[PDB]
Each structure stands twice: as C-alpha cells, then as structure tokens.
Design an enzyme around this catalytic site. Structure first.
Site, PDB file in Angstrom:
ATOM      1  N   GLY B  10       0.803  -1.209   0.000  1.00 18.14           N
ATOM      2  CA  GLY B  10       0.000   0.000   0.000  1.00 18.14           C
ATOM      3  C   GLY B  10       0.838   1.262   0.000  1.00 18.14           C
ATOM      4  O   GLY B  10       2.063   1.202   0.067  1.00 18.14           O
ATOM      5  N   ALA B  12       1.254   3.677   2.258  1.00 19.46           N
ATOM      6  CA  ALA B  12       2.017   3.897   3.481  1.00 19.46           C
ATOM      7  C   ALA B  12       3.268   3.026   3.514  1.00 19.46           C
ATOM      8  O   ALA B  12       4.367   3.516   3.773  1.00 19.46           O
ATOM      9  CB  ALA B  12       1.153   3.622   4.697  1.00 19.46           C
ATOM     10  N   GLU B  71      -2.701   0.117  -6.929  1.00 21.10           N
ATOM     11  CA  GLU B  71      -2.690   1.212  -7.892  1.00 21.10           C
ATOM     12  C   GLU B  71      -1.241   1.631  -8.153  1.00 21.10           C
ATOM     13  O   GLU B  71      -0.376   1.426  -7.302  1.00 21.10           O
ATOM     14  CB  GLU B  71      -3.528   2.388  -7.389  1.00 21.10           C
ATOM     15  N   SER B 140      -0.294  -0.108   6.318  1.00 17.60           N
ATOM     16  CA  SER B 140      -1.161   0.699   7.167  1.00 17.60           C
ATOM     17  C   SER B 140      -2.370  -0.111   7.620  1.00 17.60           C
ATOM     18  O   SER B 140      -2.740  -1.097   6.984  1.00 17.60           O
ATOM     19  CB  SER B 140      -1.627   1.955   6.428  1.00 17.60           C
ATOM     20  N   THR B 145      -5.793  -1.525   0.864  1.00 19.10           N
ATOM     21  CA  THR B 145      -4.716  -2.424   0.464  1.00 19.10           C
ATOM     22  C   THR B 145      -3.886  -2.830   1.677  1.00 19.10           C
ATOM     23  O   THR B 145      -3.646  -4.014   1.907  1.00 19.10           O
ATOM     24  CB  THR B 145      -3.796  -1.775  -0.587  1.00 19.10           C
ATOM     25  N   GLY B 146      -3.450  -1.837   2.447  1.00 18.19           N
ATOM     26  CA  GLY B 146      -2.665  -2.083   3.642  1.00 18.19           C
ATOM     27  C   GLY B 146      -3.393  -2.973   4.630  1.00 18.19           C
ATOM     28  O   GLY B 146      -2.769  -3.717   5.386  1.00 18.19           O
ATOM     29  N   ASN B 228       7.608   9.934   7.740  1.00 15.20           N
ATOM     30  CA  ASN B 228       8.341   8.757   7.284  1.00 15.20           C
ATOM     31  C   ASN B 228       9.828   8.814   7.617  1.00 15.20           C
ATOM     32  O   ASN B 228      10.427   7.801   7.976  1.00 15.20           O
ATOM     33  CB  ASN B 228       8.164   8.576   5.775  1.00 15.20           C
ATOM     34  N   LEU B 252      18.077  -9.228  16.916  1.00 16.33           N
ATOM     35  CA  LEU B 252      16.684  -8.860  17.147  1.00 16.33           C
ATOM     36  C   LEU B 252      15.871 -10.032  17.691  1.00 16.33           C
ATOM     37  O   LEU B 252      14.922  -9.838  18.450  1.00 16.33           O
ATOM     38  CB  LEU B 252      16.052  -8.344  15.851  1.00 16.33           C
ATOM     39  N   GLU B 254      16.800 -12.267  19.802  1.00 15.65           N
ATOM     40  CA  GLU B 254      17.012 -12.394  21.239  1.00 15.65           C
ATOM     41  C   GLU B 254      16.078 -11.467  22.007  1.00 15.65           C
ATOM     42  O   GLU B 254      15.508 -11.855  23.025  1.00 15.65           O
ATOM     43  CB  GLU B 254      18.467 -12.091  21.609  1.00 15.65           C
TER      44      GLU B 254
HETATM   45  N1  LIG Z   1       3.087   7.330   8.320  1.00 15.27           N
HETATM   46  C1  LIG Z   1       2.539   7.323   7.109  1.00 15.27           C
HETATM   47  N2  LIG Z   1       1.206   7.003   6.959  1.00 15.27           N
HETATM   48  C2  LIG Z   1       0.642   6.994   5.728  1.00 15.27           C
HETATM   49  C3  LIG Z   1       1.395   7.309   4.606  1.00 15.27           C
HETATM   50  N3  LIG Z   1       0.587   7.222   3.527  1.00 15.27           N
HETATM   51  C4  LIG Z   1      -0.649   6.862   3.936  1.00 15.27           C
HETATM   52  N4  LIG Z   1      -0.632   6.725   5.300  1.00 15.27           N
HETATM   53  C5  LIG Z   1      -1.759   6.333   6.166  1.00 15.27           C
HETATM   54  O1  LIG Z   1      -2.407   5.201   5.622  1.00 15.27           O
HETATM   55  C6  LIG Z   1      -3.797   5.252   5.864  1.00 15.27           C
HETATM   56  C7  LIG Z   1      -4.552   4.803   4.619  1.00 15.27           C
HETATM   57  O2  LIG Z   1      -3.855   3.737   4.016  1.00 15.27           O
HETATM   58  P1  LIG Z   1      -3.118   3.903   2.594  1.00 15.27           P
HETATM   59  O3  LIG Z   1      -1.756   3.256   2.622  1.00 15.27           O
HETATM   60  O4  LIG Z   1      -3.000   5.368   2.261  1.00 15.27           O
HETATM   61  O5  LIG Z   1      -4.110   3.211   1.524  1.00 15.27           O
HETATM   62  P2  LIG Z   1      -3.660   1.926   0.662  1.00 15.27           P
HETATM   63  O6  LIG Z   1      -2.784   1.008   1.474  1.00 15.27           O
HETATM   64  O7  LIG Z   1      -2.947   2.376  -0.589  1.00 15.27           O
HETATM   65  O8  LIG Z   1      -5.019   1.150   0.277  1.00 15.27           O
HETATM   66  P3  LIG Z   1      -6.095   1.737  -0.771  1.00 15.27           P
HETATM   67  O9  LIG Z   1      -7.338   2.173  -0.035  1.00 15.27           O
HETATM   68  O10 LIG Z   1      -6.468   0.645  -1.741  1.00 15.27           O
HETATM   69  O11 LIG Z   1      -5.507   2.911  -1.513  1.00 15.27           O
HETATM   70  C8  LIG Z   1      -4.135   6.681   6.256  1.00 15.27           C
HETATM   71  O12 LIG Z   1      -4.713   6.714   7.541  1.00 15.27           O
HETATM   72  C9  LIG Z   1      -2.816   7.425   6.249  1.00 15.27           C
HETATM   73  O13 LIG Z   1      -2.678   8.223   7.403  1.00 15.27           O
HETATM   74  C10 LIG Z   1       2.737   7.634   4.749  1.00 15.27           C
HETATM   75  O14 LIG Z   1       3.415   7.914   3.764  1.00 15.27           O
HETATM   76  N5  LIG Z   1       3.304   7.639   6.006  1.00 15.27           N
HETATM   77 MG   LIG Z   2      -3.641   3.441  -2.224  1.00 20.57          MG
END
Ligand SMILES: Nc1nc2c(ncn2[C@@H]2O[C@H](COP(=O)(O)OP(=O)(O)OP(=O)(O)O)[C@@H](O)[C@H]2O)c(=O)[nH]1
Ligand SMILES: [Mg+2]
Ligand SMILES: COc1cc2cc(c1Cl)N(C)C(=O)C[C@H](OC(=O)[C@@H](C)N(C)C(=O)CCSSC)[C@@]1(C)O[C@H]1[C@H](C)[C@@H]1C[C@@](O)(NC(=O)O1)[C@H](OC)/C=C/C=C(\C)C2
Ligand SMILES: Nc1nc2c(ncn2[C@@H]2O[C@H](COP(=O)(O)OP(=O)(O)OP(=O)(O)O)[C@@H](O)[C@H]2O)c(=O)[nH]1
Ligand SMILES: [Ca+2]
Ligand SMILES: [Mg+2]
Lengths: 67, 440, 421
Positions: B10, B12, B71, B140, B145-146, B228, B252, B254
C-alpha cells in the site's frame, strides 16, 4: 529417551503441518464464500434492472393498446 | 546468511519503504545506482548488510524487497525516483485499481487478482536466500490495500513458508492525516485476520509521530515525508542488529524472545530518542543518561499510551553510536529509582541491552539533527492495549448503526466477519488485562 | 489512469455541462482547439481523468452530449469550446419532450437511448480503468429528468461495478413557471435513490436566493445561476482532477460520504459569493448552500471540504477543528471523524482563495419535503395526469414514487434522532 525424542520432533512437524493445513482450508473457504456472496449481490442487482426492462415493455405495450 | 525479505504493501508501506531503503543505503555507503565501493567481495558475500541486500555480478547491491500496491501512481514514483536503479522492475508490483479504502476489495475483489503474482515474485527472492530468516511487512491499518491485501498475504505466507517468522510495521491511524472514515473497520479486520500469522508487530501511531514532529522538530504541519523520515530512523534502529555486527551487538531475535511472553502478546511499544532539530542540538550534547531517560517520557513513544498506568512485561534498550555499557548501567540505575517502572510479578525486571557502535545517520535536507548516539526502547507494556481500546470504541460507534457496512457486504463480506473480528479484539483487550493481574 | 465518462442530457444538463468544461479546461490550461498552453505540470498530472489524448497532443473531453431536440446541440458546437467536443459523441433526436417524464423515460428516449449507449460503449472500451460516470441534468424537465434516469438504469446494467454520479438540478417555482415539474422530480428521485451512488443536489431555489439576496441580482438569468454551479462543480471535482489524497476518485468519495446506500444525496456549498477563518464560517453557513436547506435543522452524517489557494495548512486545520467543536451537536457522534479536509495549491479563476463544501446532512429532507408538498398538491387533483397515463404509465408508478421518497425522508429522520447510547 530416544523414543520420546522422536515423539517430540514428530509432534512439532504434525502441529506445523496442521497449522499450514487449517490455514490453507480456512482461506479457501473464505474466498469461496466471498465469491458466492458478491456474485449473488450483483445477480440480484441485475434482476431488479431486468424487471425494469420488462416493466418498460409493459408500458409501451399498454400505450398502443389504448388507441 | 540469515536474509530478511521486506514487503511493502500500500501507499504507506511503499512510501515508508522509500525512506527506509534510502536510509539503509546511506548507512552502508551504498550509492543510488547500487554500487558500494567499500564492498570488495564482488558478486556476493556473507557480511551483515547482505541480510537486506543481494549482490549482482556487476557490483550492484539490490534490496531484498518487494513493493506492492493495487494502484500504480505511488510505485511509479519509485520507478522514476532517485533510487530507481536500485530495484529490479520485478520487485515493483502494481495493479490498475486500488481497494478504495475497503478491506473487502483489498482482501477479496481486487486483491485476489494479483496475490499469485506477488507470491511468485517473493518466491524468486526467497530462492536467492541460503538461509532465509523471515519477512518484514510494512503496511497501514487504515487503507484498503494495507488492511485487506496484507492480511491475505500474511495468510498465504503462512502456507508457503510455514512457521517462518513474519514481523509487522503497522501504521496505526490518526485523524490529522486520515484518508477514510472506515479506517477503524479496516483496522480491526486486519488485526483479527493477521493475529495468528504474525510473530511480532511494531505499531506506529501517526498521531504520536505527528506530535513529535510538531513538538520536537517544530514542523507546523508535518507531511508524510516528515513522518516517514522519523519512522525510518526507528525502523533502522530495530533492524540495525541485523544489518551490522559488533561485540555488544544483540540480535533482534534475542529481544523477541523476551518481548513475547505469549503468542498473542507480540506488540512491543517503541520509544526513540533523541528527536531534536539542528538548531537545538548545536552546542548541545545529549549524553547516554539523557537519551535513556527520554525513553520513559511518553511524549517520545511511537504509540500514544501511558506505561506509568500499566505494567511492564519486558524492557529492551537498543543503543547505537558512541555508547559503552558503563554509562548505560549507570543511567538505568538512576532511572529505576526515579520512574514509575513496575513489572508484572511473573517476569524478571532486568533491562536487556544491545549496542551498535555504528553512529546514527540522517538523510540530506532532513529535519532531524545528526547526533553521536541514539537509542530505541522496545518495551512490552499492558498500556499498549489503550491503542486497541480507542480503535475498538470508534468501531463500535459505527457498527451499532451498521454505518458503511454495506460497502463491505457488497464486496462479498458478511456481518459475521465484523462481529467475529470484534470479539477477537475484545479477547485481546482481556488478554492484556489478565497478564497484568498478580499471580495466585 | 482512471477515466471518468461525462454525460450531459437535456437543456439544463448541456448548459451547466458546457460551462463545467469551460472552467476546468481553463484550469488545466487547454484551448478550445484541444492544445495545451499552460505553465505547471500539475495541470496534466491527472488530465486523463476527463480528457482523451489524440494525435498531435490534442486533448478531447470524454463527454457525451444528449438531448431530444437538436436545438441545444448547435448551441454547444457554436458556443466557446464547441470545437473541442467529439463530433460523433453528439447524439440528438427530433422530438422534444415538453416537460413530460414518460416520453423521456419510456417512449421518445427509449428509442434514442441505444445510440447513446453506443457512444458510451465506445468511450468506455478505450478506458484504461473506467471508474464511473457523472451525469449533468435537471429533474423538472422531461428529457433530462426522464431519459437521464433511463440511461442510468441502462448504463448500470452494462457497468454495474462502476460508480454512478449525478449533478441533479432541482426545480423551483422561482425560476421555472412550468407547473408539472414536481411530478418529473418525484419520478426522477424514485430512480436516483435506487440507481446512483452519489447525487449532488443542485437546487434552483437556493441558486435563485443566492443571486437575488446575496449577489444582489434581481431577475437573475440562467447565466447567473450557472456561474454558481460551474464554481461548485469545479470545486467538488478538484480532488478528482489534481494530484491529491482525500477522495481522489468517485469510489473513495462514496465510501467516505455514504454511510447508507439510499442516503447519498449531498447538499453542496461554496465560498465566497479573505482569511481562513472567514472562509470556514461562510461555507458552513446556510446562505452558502446550493441546496435550499438549513444544516442546523438536522445533523451532518459526513462532510467533505476543499480549500483552494495558497494558505497556511495549520490555520485551516485549526479552524476546521474549531467549527466541529462549536457546532458539535450538528455532527452525528456515532460516526467519529466524519469531516475530511482537502487542500489544492491551485486556486480557481479570479479568486485568490476559495472553499467548496460537500455535506451529507439529514436536513436535506427539507428539499424533498418541498417537492413532496408540491407533488401531492397536483396529484390529489390528478392535475395533468392524463399526459402521463396516455404514454402508457400507471397511477401506481406515481404512488410508488411518492411513497419511496416519503421513505427516504423518514430514513434521513431516523438517523437524525439516533444516538450513540
Ligand atoms: N506514516 C505514514 N502514513 C501513511 C502514509 N501514507 C498513507 N498513510 C496512512 O495510511 C492510511 C490509509 O492507508 P493507505 O496506505 O493510504 O491506503 P492503501 O494502502 O494504498 O489502500 P487503498 O485504499 O487501496 O488505496 C491513512 O490513515 C494514512 O494516514 C505515509 O506515507 N506515512
Ligand atoms: Mg492506495
Ligand atoms: C389548464 O391550465 C394550463 C393549460 C396549459 C398549460 C399549463 C396550464 Cl396550468 N401549464 C402552465 C403547464 O405547465 C402544463 C404542462 O405543460 C407544460 O409544462 C408547458 C409549460 N409546456 C409543455 C412547455 O413546453 C413550455 C411552453 S411551450 S415551448 C415551444 C402540463 C402541466 O403537464 C405538462 C404536460 C406533461 C405536457 C403538455 C403537452 O406539452 N405535451 C406533453 O407532452 O406534456 C403540450 O404540448 C403538446 C403542452 C400544452 C400546454 C397546455 C396543456 C396549456
Ligand atoms: N440552473 C439552471 N436550471 C435550468 C437551466 N435550464 C433549465 N433549467 C431548469 O430545468 C427545468 C426544466 O428542465 P429542462 O432541462 O428545461 O427540460 P429539458 O431537459 O430541456 O427537456 P424538455 O422536457 O424536453 O424541455 C426548469 O425547472 C428550469 O428551471 C439552466 O440553464 N440553469
Ligand atoms: Ca560483497
Ligand atoms: Mg428541452
């Protein structure tokens, strides 16, 4: 003692395979259940649209049957 | 050997991957094209940095990593970025349509169309390993996705790699940078599905990182770039033991032995210091005692919680830079007689220490000052359950009215999966409560 | 990329549709010839969302122009940015509905609809990844109200897994002296509640009041009303047209805005008609809503707000937090963090900084109650009902449409009275 040593390592393999096994089946179950539900939702959606076409045919038919 | 394969899922995960791998290169003196002059063993080697980097005959050091997103626009930036030469085109995997902040789409609808390809590309990396140790999964909780695709992947990995260790770097959602209202739903669903398949998970509260950037770096409105770059430092500190060697270097694994008393209790609280601007760090040397004491300031935690109102099950200190055991032991002795540190009765109170003489590194044009020494505390506290509690509360408010639930049902999910996941979280909160109770 | 297929049906639809293309074409910096002459690469980052790239770097709007009378067709082709539209995408009949909902939905439109779908199909097949369709039309007329809702049902048959968006213009006796409009609206709403994922409630009653009371324009022309619509439509699509984070596509927008499928009728807002606190207080004011409804008569289920222009993101975040605290009673507590804010560096034309508002408020019922009141006044007398039944319709379809909208109102009321405990 040697016999016990075998039973332990065999138990480790068994439990490991069972975890892989149950995980594989639990997943295949979900993906199958999800496929059925999503299809049934789309299938229902189209059926309601199909009923609108049938309704339209009944409207257009009803028009010419009043002339 | 003992290679570690990083998987970035994803937006993040991917963007944090950029910060991490950019930081790794600078630490190991690796250039953007992948060349490493200091590395005399061309084509291969068994050095410490080889745990994260494979080597080609042309002298290129290639990250043992895979980038995955449903994407293309975020990974397209990697394909054309400064470190585009660093990755083989097959390491960067993309779809055409994201999960739209939906766990269902990421796990089922869209995810199932790419899961086989991803696993094949992961296998190609694993086959280059002479002794694969495990995986590091960056993602995330909030995104579709995350949340969705990660849980699918973690399950598949458990099948294809058995009990091979799988670590997480989860981005806990925050309203200051949230992207969707249903992120609480996605958070619970992923935590539930991933729980049995994860050996250790380091949660990162975006709000915690947000506050640290505003407070300690004086960034009025932190961007993902600001967050980040700070996150990558914590990740670097945790992976430093794998990427470097030394006498006082503790692996790590341990730490992980001490950090996980029970399988489900595998969420360590991370606390990093010093986070300071170049302006403030000038003519200001933060000693070992100062940075160690900072690890017990809740304002420096990766997750918003209060350990002082909880019980410790483990306390690990991962130092790096100019640090010797003498100054550590003194700083620890002082802290114990001045801080609200209390362990559960069924565990020892000894702090486990590790030191990597390799000093901290900062990315050019960064906000973080370059310090001679840094530290990351990994503690197992019952207080982390507060993070679960806050998420579960927001989950309950919406699910009571079944708000936004139709978006999930439409993609094939059932309400039974929502209740099932929530019950598991309720049990998890109960588990963290039970481990704190004194023994009979 | 992620392409959106635009459709404009009926007079009202093509008018605001044309204006919509005039404004964004200027923002993305392209001339009526289809060539790019801008200065920032951000203009072309996501140009493919609304435009097809042809030979010689020629950007062609992914638009489909529709009407049951060839009059308006020449208006667009003759008007500015008329040479940019694809000639084949012009689809025109020779009938003219005459504010009859049945002709557009069952008779006249049902004949021309296929030739429209052919254009939709040709456009869609060339999409790398079609995300959905957006429709511009009115609900008071016959073609835009009738055929517009027919196309939606037809498009949804071939593209059920895509998002269906609509910019529906609501009728008002202050603008149109047409008497039968509250029929066409109710019949349209009966469809929109079932077959659309998100509907922007453009209300002429609101557009009239704004031009008259705020902008000080007695006897406002349609050109005055559309200057508000064009500004509104430009704002609510900013997140779709420029590189962003919040609600960057039609689906992610719907996921964040629609807690229940039927409750997808938004009341947009725009400001001004300055500093950051000023903008924020105005966009949440009832005077700046493009739907004749007072948000303090109900509760916000969800809210999306875009701020455009060069400003401090710190100040915007503080003010958006400030409003939610001072007006916490007007946001449902059982949906945490239901207000999302976006920021685009590029401002609109003329304004140094602006703010667009998208709200899913339960106070939208005030709009559906107005129509329902006007509807039942006609239907009790069966006033001009023979014009409908003559086209083959039934009295039931009028009854079903009435009760379905009555359910929508009560459902908006249900979640308004709902509490956390
Ligand atoms: N720390 C940090 N958090 C992020 C970043 N990009 C997105 N997020 C967090 O990720 C959450 C949403 O997940 P995303 O990673 O943006 O979405 P995705 O994983 O691409 O999944 P999709 O919905 O299909 O686009 C949000 O709450 C954001 O705050 C980043 O670059 N750094
Ligand atoms: Mg996305
Ligand atoms: C009894 O008192 C009357 C009498 C009449 C009109 C009205 C009233 Cl209250 N008014 C004000 C309406 O609104 C009636 C409305 O028709 C419209 O909406 C108008 C304004 N139309 C159709 C226009 O096109 C605008 C001016 S003509 S521009 C070249 C009736 C109320 O319901 C419509 C009906 C559905 C419509 C009438 C008729 O147009 N043909 C149709 O298909 O239907 C037909 O066309 C062949 C129209 C003829 C109009 C008639 C019946 C005269
Ligand atoms: N805001 C705005 N409303 C308009 C405009 N043109 C028409 N309307 C409204 O649209 C309603 C009637 O629908 P029309 O679009 O005129 O009907 P049509 O789509 O041309 O189809 P016909 O029934 O054949 O006339 C009236 O209540 C008008 O107030 C316009 O340019 N701007
Ligand atoms: Ca080597
Ligand atoms: Mg007309």
């Amino acid at each position: 003692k040697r016999e016990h040593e075998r039973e332990v390592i065999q138990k480790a393999i068994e439990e490991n395979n069972n975890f892989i096994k149950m995980a594989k089946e639990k997943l295949a179950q979900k993906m199958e259940s999800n496929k059925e539900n999503r299809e049934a939702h789309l299938a229902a959606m189209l059926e309601r649209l199909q009923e609108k076409d049938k309704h339209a045919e009944e409207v257009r038919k009803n028009k010419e049957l009043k002339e | 050997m003992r290679e570690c394969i990083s998987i970035h899922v994803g937006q993040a995960g991917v963007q944090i991957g950029n910060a991490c791998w950019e930081l790794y290169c600078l630490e190991h003196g690796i250039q953007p094209d992948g060349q490493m002059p200091s590395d005399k063993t061309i084509g291969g080697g068994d050095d410490s940095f080889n745990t994260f980097f494979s080597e080609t005959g042309a002298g290129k050091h290639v990250p043992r990593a895979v980038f995955v997103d449903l994407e293309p626009t975020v990974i397209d930036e990697v394909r054309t970025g400064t470190y585009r030469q660093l990755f083989h085109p097959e390491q960067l995997i993309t779809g055409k349509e994201d999960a739209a902040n939906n766990y269902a789409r990421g796990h089922y609808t869209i995810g199932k169309e790419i899961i086989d390809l991803v696993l094949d590309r992961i296998r190609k990396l694993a086959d280059q390993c002479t002794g694969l140790q495990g995986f590091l999964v960056f993602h995330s909780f909030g995104g579709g996705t995350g949340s969705g695709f990660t849980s699918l992947l973690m399950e598949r990995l458990s099948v294809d790699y058995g009990k091979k260790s799988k670590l997480e770097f989860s981005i806990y959602p925050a309203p200051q940078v949230s992207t969707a209202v249903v992120e609480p739903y996605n958070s619970i669903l992923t935590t539930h599905t991933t729980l049995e398949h994860s050996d250790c998970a380091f949660m990162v509260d975006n709000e915690a990182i947000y506050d640290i950037c505003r407070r300690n770096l004086d960034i009025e409105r932190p961007t993902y770039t600001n967050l980040n770059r700070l996150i990558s430092q914590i990740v670097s500190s945790i992976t430093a033991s794998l990427r470097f060697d030394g006498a006082l270097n503790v692996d790590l694994t341990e730490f992980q032995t001490n950090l996980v008393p029970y399988p489900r209790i595998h969420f360590p609280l991370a606390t990093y210091a010093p986070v300071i601007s170049a302006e403030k760090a000038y003519h200001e040397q933060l000693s070992v005692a100062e940075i160690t004491n900072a690890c017990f300031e809740p304002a420096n935690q990766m997750v918003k919680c209060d350990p002082r109102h909880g019980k410790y099950m483990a306390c690990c200190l991962l130092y790096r830079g100019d640090v010797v055991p003498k100054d550590v032991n003194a700083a620890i002795a002082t802290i114990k007689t001045k801080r609200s540190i209390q362990f559960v009765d069924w565990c020892p109170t000894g702090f486990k220490v590790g030191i990597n003489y390799q000093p901290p590194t900062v990315v050019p044009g960064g906000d973080l000052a370059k310090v001679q020494r840094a530290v990351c505390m990994l503690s197992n506290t019952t207080a982390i359950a507060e993070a679960w509690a806050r998420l579960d509360h927001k989950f309950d408010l919406m699910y009571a009215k079944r708000a936004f639930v139709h978006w999930y049902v439409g993609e094939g999910m059932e309400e039974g999966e929502f209740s099932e996941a929530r019950e598991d979280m309720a049990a998890l909160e109960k588990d963290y409560e039970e481990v704190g109770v004194d023994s009979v | 990329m992620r392409e959106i297929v635009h459709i404009q049906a009926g007079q009202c639809g093509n008018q605001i549709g044309a204006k919509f293309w005039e404004v964004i074409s200027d923002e993305h910096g392209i001339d009526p010839t289809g060539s790019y002459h801008g200065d920032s690469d951000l203009q072309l980052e996501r140009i493919n969302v609304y435009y097809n790239e042809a030979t010689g770097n020629k950007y062609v709007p992914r638009a489909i122009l529709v009407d049951l009378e060839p009059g308006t067709m020449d208006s667009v082709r003759s008007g500015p940015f008329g040479q940019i539209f694809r000639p084949d995408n012009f689809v025109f009949g020779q009938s003219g509905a005459g504010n009859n909902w049945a002709k557009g939905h069952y008779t006249e439109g049902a004949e021309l609809v296929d030739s429209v779908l052919d254009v939709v199909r040709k456009e869609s097949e060339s999409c790398d990844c079609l995300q959905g369709f957006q429709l511009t039309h009115s609900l008071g007329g016959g073609t835009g109200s009738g055929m517009g809702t027919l196309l939606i049902s037809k498009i949804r048959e071939e593209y059920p897994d895509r998002i269906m968006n609509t910019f529906s213009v609501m009728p008002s006796p202050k603008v149109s002296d047409t008497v039968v409009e509250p029929y066409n609206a109710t019949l349209s709403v009966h469809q929109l509640v079932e077959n659309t994922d998100e509907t922007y409630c453009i209300d002429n009653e609101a557009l009239y009041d704004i031009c008259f009371r705020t902008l000080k324009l007695t006897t406002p022309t349609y050109g005055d009303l559309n200057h508000l619509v064009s500004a509104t439509m430009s704002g609510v699509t900013t997140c779709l047209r420029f590189p962003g984070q919040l609600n960057a596509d039609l689906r992610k927008l719907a996921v964040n805005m629609v807690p229940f499928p039927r409750l997808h009728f938004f009341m947009p807002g725009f400001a001004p008609l300055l500093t950051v606190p000023e903008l924020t207080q105005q966009m949440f004011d009832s005077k700046n809503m493009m739907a004749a409804c007072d948000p303090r008569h109900g509760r916000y289920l969800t809210v999306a707000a875009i701020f455009r222009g060069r400003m401090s993101m710190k100040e915007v975040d503080e003010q958006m937090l400030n409003v939610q605290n001072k007006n916490s009673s007007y946001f449902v507590e059982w949906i945490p963090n239901n207000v999302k804010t976006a920021v685009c560096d590029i401002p609109p034309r003329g304004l140094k900084m602006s703010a667009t508002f998208i709200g899913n408020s339960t106070a939208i019922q005030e709009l559906f109650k107005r129509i329902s009141e006007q509807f039942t006044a006609m239907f009790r007398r069966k006033a001009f009902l023979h014009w409908y039944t003559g086209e083959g319709m039934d009295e039931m379809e009028f009854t079903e449409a009435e009760s379905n909208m009555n359910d929508l109102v009560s459902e908006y009321q249900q979640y308004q009275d709902a509490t956390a405990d």
